[PDB]
Design a protein around this ligand. Structure first.
Ligand code: QDN
Ligand code: QDN
Ligand code: QDN
Ligand code: QDN
Ligand code: QDN
Ligand code: QDN
Lengths: 173, 173, 173, 173, 173, 173
């Protein structure tokens, strides 16, 4: 049952790309304009927002998508050159795809966790002592985070199934 | 009378996609900037808006559209793979489409109801006791909600008609 | 003269679609941001604007365009299905197009009238008693309304001419 | 010399379309947000702006372009219909194009004049007595107005030359 | 060595078009929003900005690009018409291109100079006596101005080289 | 193996172009609106922002991408011209590409360094003495800077490998 694996993998990849490309930018549009802190100190908003969200989720997901798609591009361009052998490059492509997917999933978990809290406690200069700041659309962002994690997990499972189907003896050679 | 069913189903799907893609983003553009609460507490607006609208209607509808279209994509890519059998995958595709459509309709009803009230009563921290907040374009959003519900219901009816036409004996086998 | 009527009908349909798609969104961009009421009560602007304009003109016109174009799409997809009889579906398509056009014209008249006044008197909660609100670009909106009404009337006349040419005896059967 | 007349006419039409489509929207983006009146009365800005600029230049020019292009569309669709005679429709097309171009040029002159003043005197309700308002980018708008007038005049001259070349005897018949 | 001249000319033209189309609009987006004058007089900002920048650089460059490309369009359409002689139109096309390029370069120099100062002294009504106004991103605009001047100069040199290659005897005839 | 070297070079070039075109504009959208200085002097924000960021990173990267792609365009157009010899232009194209890449990398290092500080100290007129200003999203910009530097370094290494493979004897001739 390897053909169904590839079918589902392609469908899931397209689904993830479409969802991101259509809604991600709109969800994270006013992340900084609607981020407000309870203070009068100029520049506290910028520092506290920067500490709270070092990298926006959408940038990370775009980078992940492009990086995960890279090996297929490598294989396609190698095939194009080879005309005007290919049974070995495929195994290395699969291995690299597996590694990249697993790494990106683990990185997302270690970077963002599983939820976006509605309050933040900030103690960065120039803010005096400790201040409280309020986030925009925490619930929608939490839902988006969980959904992306689930899709990435499905992709990882399918890739592992494909790699196992190929077998360890072929991978070693 | 199965051909007219498929014709109407395709027309309705295209109609829904076009309507959403053309007007949905514009309708819900200033949902948060025009949402105002009667208070002086910083951060009350963000919390009350997040509680009032955990997920925007437009994103739910986009997700529904992509998810409902997925099975056709799976069938098409399976057909492409088969060339360079198909009379059985079709039944499962129809069943899954029916299930997804019914589930999404029920979920919409249980999430949003049938109207968008013009006032909201919010008692979430940091707001003090109860505060009153005012929504933007409640009537247009109500009309959009009802129209989308009606279109989804028509799609459900057509899908059920198709499934019944196929017959229970074929579905069992 | 049915064929020359068809030529004119196609030209006017394309003209209407182009005009809407190019200028409608820009005209109605700042309808709510520039709508101001003479009061200090929070939330009066939102309620009064919602009462004044339950549905924006542009969205109504987009819906009308798609709905009017639907029957041609149904006929085209039926023709595609028939290959890989057609002289009867055409009459029903014409009748439905006529009915839809007339209904949309009447609905526009009953919903918006023939002008957009520059002042509005609003007595909706939370506004205290009666307040006065001021509209944005009333004259441009009036011109747009009249122009769309005229184009729709021309389309109705051409459709009626075509239906009359087909004759009542054919329509009956 | 009819070859060069048609060549220049086509080039000029394309030039005008490109210039409008590329710069018109950007020039007139902040016409109303940067329009300011010297008063404290709410609603005076809206009324005075509406009186000063009943119709924006860009929308008038877009309407003119589409209307002027319409006869060519009619001729092309008639030619398409005729396949799956044409030596007469061409003369009427030319006459209608000439009439439309001349009418639009005269209308522009009578609507906007030749310059956009930097100050406006407004005495419209609710403004008290007479107030002074200030326009945004008057000089760029004046340049755009003059350039469009010159291009339209060139088009009119070329169309008149073409019509004269056809001759009065043919036009009469 | 004429082929290299044409190759470099085409490459430079494409380079200029790409650079403008990609960055010009973004650079000059907030030219008027961030232009601030030290005064309390309403309407002083509009008048002083209009006096400082009668025409934005980006619009001048767009006009220059289209005008310079026009003669090639004229030649191409003449060639297209000629099928369903050409060795003479080419010389006039080259001469007109040279003249247009030189004229636009000189006009840019006489209009904008070589730098955008960071301060402006304005004495236009309604501003009282002299006021000081501050520009947005003077350095980026200076860099853009110098770069465009250099590219236009390279184009002028290449066009002059081509024209000289053709020779004076051929041009005279 | 330059074959796989060229494969990797093409893949990394496409990767860089995609990343820039998709995220660069969004990251640097509100660079100036969110830049705030601790002062009351009008015009201090503009001057201090201009001194802090003479040229935005995104524009520099766009210019670098187009300039680096230019030699391939020159070679392609020369090949097109040659039809309706080519073994020497390739070496010069490679040399020029190497030089451009190295120059742009060095320029980026000397212009921006390796980090974007969160505070800036500004002493430019009209600001009185020395003032403190606060940057927007310093961490995301630092990450972007480092990532672009790494990608450019990889491209430089691959280009150097290709040039070395071609050999010094061929380059000399
Ligand atoms: C005018 C369009 C702009 C809007 N987004 C930012 C740059 C462009 C395009 C891009 C988006 O439409 C988009 C298109 C295609 N693929 C995408 C893939 C990912 C993505 O992530 C935000 C956005 C994508
Ligand atoms: C510059 C264009 C941007 C505007 N919207 C957000 C990202 C892109 C595209 C998309 C919209 O045009 C759009 C296009 C196509 N299909 C769509 C399907 C659904 C949709 O839901 C809002 C929007 C769609
Ligand atoms: C980035 C582009 C966005 C701008 N408008 C909203 C969603 C998209 C597209 C659409 C408009 O360009 C448009 C395109 C094509 N047909 C249209 C038909 C009707 C229409 O009514 C406003 C707008 C149309
Ligand atoms: C996202 C794109 C939007 C920007 N303008 C408003 C609606 C759309 C398209 C249109 C413009 O690009 C445009 C394209 C093509 N032809 C045009 C013709 C005239 C025009 O006048 C403003 C604008 C045109
Ligand atoms: C949604 C897109 C809009 C953005 N700019 C204004 C109108 C349209 C297109 C245009 C720009 O993308 C553009 C495209 C193609 N050629 C251009 C050539 C010149 C240019 O100068 C600003 C802008 C160009
Ligand atoms: C409506 C679209 C506008 C958005 N950006 C500014 C002008 C246009 C296009 C461009 C961007 O989509 C884009 C497209 C394609 N290639 C690009 C390459 C580089 C780039 O750097 C910001 C932006 C690119």
């Amino acid at each position: 049952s390897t053909m169904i694996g590839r079918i589902l993998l392609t469908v899931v990849v397209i689904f993830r790309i479409l969802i991101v490309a259509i809604v991600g930018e709109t969800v994270y549009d006013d992340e900084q304009t609607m981020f407000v802190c309870n203070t009068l100190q100029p520049g506290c908003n910028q520092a506290c927002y920067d500490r709270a969200f070092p990298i926006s989720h959408i940038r990370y997901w775009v980078f992940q998508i492009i990086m995960v798609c890279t090996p297929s591009l490598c294989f396609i361009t190698y095939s194009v050159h080879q005309s005007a052998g290919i049974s070995r490059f495929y195994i290395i492509q699969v291995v690299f795809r597996n590694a990249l997917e697993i790494g990106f999933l683990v990185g997302q978990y270690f970077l963002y966790g599983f939820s976006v809290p509605g309050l933040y406690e900030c103690n960065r200069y120039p803010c005096i002592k400790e201040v409280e700041c309020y986030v925009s659309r925490p619930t929608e962002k939490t839902v988006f985070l969980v959904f992306m994690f689930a899709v990435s997990g499905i992709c990882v499972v399918l890739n592992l199934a494909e790699l196992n189907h190929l077998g360890w003896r072929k991978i070693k050679l």
